[PDB]
Design a protein around this ligand. Structure first.
Ligand SMILES: O=C1N=C(NCc2cccs2)S/C1=C/c1ccc2ncccc2c1
Ligand SMILES: [Mg+2]
Lengths: 257, 300
């Protein structure tokens, strides 16, 4: 707890800069939020098959979102962009990332090794080699330090909810990672213990329950409708005892806020 | 700008990855350093070390961190273009072998290195390969952290990261004993070793293997127990058979150093990662009260 304060400041400054264009999907001629949702859901599966860190997945989505802010992509090439972005995310964050051959294998022979490699170059060129982006995950782990005391169920649920935000560009593309993490942390904290956004996190972030409310309203809805959603990989993932089976828990009927 | 505008002058050396060349811009006259990475040989695309170095060096913007001017991006090779300074510190210590580096310049350098590292840590960046070879000096008394190939953007709090980390001689005890987590403290440890090296004119702990490295540390700083390092005896790579050595006098380890200098050094080489001085707090230390910026002499 010597650099923790100015790291948080720096990350709060960076999330504004590594932010994707709010309504980029409207300007995309051939792809929609639905397709994006399929893409991200598939990336969740990849992360499960290769036991990848949550951070890697959150980075991949940021990379994809920024790439699509400046480049038009046809639907049949959207999976290539996701693959290259997952590959870059892995090289950046993972101790042992999967090799390129393994990334070719999970596309069911739709793309060649050559294509995935050229796309890697193109993503890097477009993102201009800036890959150290702030994520929901990074803000969450910081918030977890303020638990009185440390609770394993709440940690896993906050991760599950923060993850759900990645699937749906509408609305979550309009919120900063620190806001989403805040809303997620409070929602997980209320669900398991009944406790609320802690006093110490008000001092740290400058966020109140009132300032978090918009995002917290959407996130409650996504949580309640989670078994309905066309995409289910996240729910399947958080069934596991690794995450204490938090997806199977009953969400609260209302926040009362 | 394309490689056509660059004339290679000399091959300088091998990095943690790639090959460093001195080169000259044919249009502007500007002397640069180039880091050449071949994307052939290893058909895994752009390597992670390059990916991490480029993205972290583009964020980091400090007078004591090497400046990255450009990234040239073929499908054949990848070049990084840096400002050309004079010389790496290892080469400078070789050039100053006969006379040694004056204490005021050692003070100046350590001060600037701590400033660069502090800026690094405040931006969630671990260097993880601080050593003379990876530090660059110029002709007017500046020094800069270079080679971020083995660097990592870390999280608060940290996960388990790569265990290979840091050139053996400069490797912290927590890595050697195989702790689950390590952090900014490992960069501090390396600086301490560099600091002593500049003063004593030889490496502080020149071990040959992991186990020999530990024993050289244990002999100088005393074997760690529960009082000095809470929980050391339970660490994965600790052995009951370790020789229980006593800490030796620090004015014997580093003779030319004043009381202020010994104080800082003993805090930079504290066993407990938690109790080890930060780069931020080390800048406050009385040792740096009368710090100046001398030029380096290199020809005698
Ligand atoms: O000097 C650099 N060193 C790097 N890693 C290890 C090496 C040290 C010396 C040769 S290889 S990367 C790097 C870049 C760089 C930047 C500016 C320079 N200015 C003068 C001389 C060498 C330089 C190297
Ligand atoms: Mg559209």
């Amino acid at each position: 707890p010597d650099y923790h304060e100015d790291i948080h400041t720096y990350l709060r400054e960076m999330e504004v800069k590594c932010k994707p264009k709010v309504g980029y999907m409207k300007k995309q001629p051939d792809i929609t939020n639905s397709m994006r949702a399929i893409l991200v859901d598939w990336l969740v599966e990849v992360g499960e098959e290769y036991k990848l860190q949550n951070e890697t997945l959150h980075l991949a989505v940021n990379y994809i979102d920024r790439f699509l802010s400046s480049m038009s992509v046809l639907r049949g090439k959207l999976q290539l962009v996701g693959t290259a972005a997952m590959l870059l995310a892995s090289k950046f964050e993972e101790i042992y990332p999967p090799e390129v051959a393994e990334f070719v294998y999970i596309t069911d022979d739709t793309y060649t090794k050559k294509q995935v490699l050229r796309m890697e170059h193109l993503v890097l060129k477009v993102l201009t080699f800036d890959l150290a982006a702030p994520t929901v995950n990074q803000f969450l782990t910081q918030y977890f330090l303020h638990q009185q005391p440390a609770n394993c169920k709440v940690e896993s649920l906050a991760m599950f909810l923060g993850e759900l935000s990645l699937i749906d560009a509408d609305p979550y593309l309009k919120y900063l990672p620190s806001v989403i993490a805040g809303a997620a942390f409070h929602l997980a904290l209320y669900t398991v213990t009944g406790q609320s956004w802690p006093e110490s996190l008000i001092r740290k972030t400058g966020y109140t329950l009132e300032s978090l409310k918009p995002c917290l309203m959407d996130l409650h809805q996504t949580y309640l409708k989670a078994p309905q959603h066309a995409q289910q990989s996240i729910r399947e993932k958080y069934k596991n005892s690794k995450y204490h089976g938090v997806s199977l828990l009953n969400p609260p009927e209302t926040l009362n806020l | 700008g394309s490689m056509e505008n660059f004339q290679k002058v000399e091959k300088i050396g091998e990095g943690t990855y790639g090959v460093v060349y001195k080169a000259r811009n044919k249009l502007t006259g500007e002397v640069v350093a180039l880091k050449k990475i071949r994307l052939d040989t290893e058909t895994e695309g752009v390597p992670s070390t390059a990916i991490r170095e480029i993205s972290l060096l583009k964020e980091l913007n400090h007078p004591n961190i090497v400046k990255l001017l450009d990234v040239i991006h073929t499908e054949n090779k990848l070049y990084l273009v840096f400002e050309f300074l004079s010389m790496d510190l290892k080469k400078f210590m070789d050039a100053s072998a006969l006379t040694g580096i004056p204490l005021p310049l050692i003070k100046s350098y350590l001060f600037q290195l701590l400033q660069g590292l502090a800026f690094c840590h405040s931006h969630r960046v671990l260097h993880r390969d601080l050593k003379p070879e990876n530090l660059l000096i110029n002709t007017e008394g500046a020094i800069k952290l270079a080679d971020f190939g083995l660097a990592r953007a870390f999280g608060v709090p940290v996960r388990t990261y790569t265990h290979e980390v840091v050139t053996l001689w400069y490797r912290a005890p927590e890595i050697l004993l195989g702790c689950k987590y390590y952090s900014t403290a490992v960069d501090i440890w390396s600086l301490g070793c560099i600091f002593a090296e500049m003063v004593t004119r030889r490496a502080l702990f020149p071990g040959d293997s992991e186990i020999d490295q530990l024993f050289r540390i244990f002999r100088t700083l005393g074997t760690p127990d529960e009082v000095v390092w809470p929980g050391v005896t339970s660490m994965p790579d600790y052995k009951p058979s370790f020789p229980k050595w006593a800490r030796q006098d620090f004015s014997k380890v580093v003779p030319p150093l004043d009381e202020d200098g010994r104080s800082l050094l003993s805090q930079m080489l504290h066993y407990d990662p938690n109790k080890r001085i930060s780069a931020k707090a080390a800048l406050a230390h009385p040792f740096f009260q009368d710090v100046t910026k001398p030029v380096p002499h290199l020809r005698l």
